[PDB]
Structure formats: structure tokens, C-alpha cells
């Protein structure tokens, strides 16, 4: 894969070249924070509609929920919304899907129990964040990085 952060002219050139190479060959390509360049997203959608790509090729591109994102690209693409999971069960399921089994299964045997305790604590504090402004004073950012 090739990951590019949108926002520079060199970034636009690199994204165009990586997309052309991925169409020609069949590797994946990613380009992130696309809500900062809607005018460029216009012609990106145009050239992606015009071009016929390789059979095994996926174009991933992330953005925040932004009204500036073009409607034509938003309609041509496949939309997935990544919000914090509502529910302790959903939070733990996302946590255990994210955590690799090989890393969680390393000796000693209490590593998985500690990971489960961290998952429960993370779910509790994230649901308390959802129950603002009484669970917490402000909307903190507790997430996968922490």
C-alpha cells in the first residue's frame, strides 16, 4: 500500500502517481484527510470514473464528517461511518477485534486478563463521555491511541 496525507502540492502529485501505478499494477493506495481538498476531490472522482482499474485494487480515502465533501464523490464512493461504538459490548467487541491474538496470547497468562480489564475501563469511560456533561465536564478524546 501507499499512504499519502492530503494537503500539499507534492502530496497531490504523489497521490496521482501512486493511483496511476496502482491502476497499472494492482496494489492498494491510500490518501487521508481528503476533506481539506474538495476541489481536488472533484477531479479525483472524475478521473476515477474515467479510468478502468485493475481487478484487485482498492482506493481507501478518509475524511471527517464535513459538508464540504463533494456530493458526486460521496455518491460514487462506498461510505463507512467510524463513530465511537454505542454500548459496552460494542466497545469490547471493537477492542478485541483490534487487539491481535498473537500479542494478547503471549506469556504470562494474566496478559489477556489485564487487556480485558483495560477494555472494560475504556468502555466505561467512553460511555461516560457519551453521557456528557455529567459523566465528564468536557468531551475528552479517549480512543485507540490511548
Amino acid at each position: 500500500i501507499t499512504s499519502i496525507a492530503i494537503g500539499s502540492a507534492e502530496g497531490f502529485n504523489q497521490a496521482d502517481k501512486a493511483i496511476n501505478t496502482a491502476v497499472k499494477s494492482g496494489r492498494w493506495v491510500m490518501l487521508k484527510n481528503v476533506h481539506l481538498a474538495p476541489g481536488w476531490l472533484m477531479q479525483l472522482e472524475k478521473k476515477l470514473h474515467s479510468l478502468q482499474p485493475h481487478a484487485c485494487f482498492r482506493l481507501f480515502l478518509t475524511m471527517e464528517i464535513n459538508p464540504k465533501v463533494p456530493v458526486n464523490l460521496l455518491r460514487a464512493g462506498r461510505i463507512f461511518v467510524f463513530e465511537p461504538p454505542p454500548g459496552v459490548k460494542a466497545n469490547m467487541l471493537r477492542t478485541f477485534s483490534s487487539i491481535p491474538v498473537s500479542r494478547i496470547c503471549k506469556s504470562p497468562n494474566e496478559r489477556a486478563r489485564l487487556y480485558f480489564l483495560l477494555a472494560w475501563f475504556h468502555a466505561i469511560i467512553q460511555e461516560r463521555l457519551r453521557y456528557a456533561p455529567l459523566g465528564w465536564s468536557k468531551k475528552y478524546e479517549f480512543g485507540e491511541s490511548d
Binding site: 492530503i6 494537503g7 500539499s8
Partner: protein
Amino acid sequence: RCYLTMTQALEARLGGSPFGPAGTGKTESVKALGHQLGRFVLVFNCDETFDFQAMGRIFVGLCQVGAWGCFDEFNRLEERMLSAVSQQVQCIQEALREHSNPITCELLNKQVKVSPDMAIFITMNPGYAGRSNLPDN
């Protein structure tokens, strides 16, 4: 608490981001930690004119010297420049993790050597003048 958090960030090969209102001792705390550890600490009063190429050039200088870089008011760089700089920061942190284990990573489309003594620190005040928001990546 500042020393503990920033040394945890340093051992995790991540940067340090003290935040708060003005006059709380963020830049001076970063400089004090750097001086206690014995590093050359460079203070940058960064701007919206801090280009991607300019930021890459100060990154390659900082990496080659092995010096600490404190970027005060980091949320003034604009959204798109900030997102572009995120890639260089990620590459530098990957190089640092590689050193932790001729250890070089690409910056500004050129091969530049990375020293273990360097670090990136950013200091900001949220909502000082309607400043930019840091992207999640």
C-alpha cells in the same frame, strides 16, 4: 508530572504535546527537560507560512544534528500543511523505532540520516485565536 508524561512519550518513540492556557510553563518545561537530559533544544515560533518544504528542511536538520525541537503554537500551521507534516512526523518516528530495534528514512524525497537523541515537541493553546485543529492521524 510533565517530566513523567514526556519521558513516557519519549520511550514510546512518540512526541510530546503539552497544552493549556498561556503562561502555564509549557515551553520552559520542555526546555528544562531537554537541558536536564543534556540535549540541544531548538525553539520554533511556528507560523502559517511554515511550508511543507520548510518543515521538512528543519526536520532533516534536527534529525542530522540529534537535537530537540519545540514547536510553540503548533496549531497555527493551517489544516492542510499540518496534515502534510503528519507524514514526516510518522516517518521520523518510524526511523526512531528502527534505531531502537545507516539508519535513514526519506524526508523531502531525499535520504537523510536520523540520530537517536532527537525529539519532536509541540506546544499549543486550544482556541487562542480560532486556530487550526490537529488531524487525528
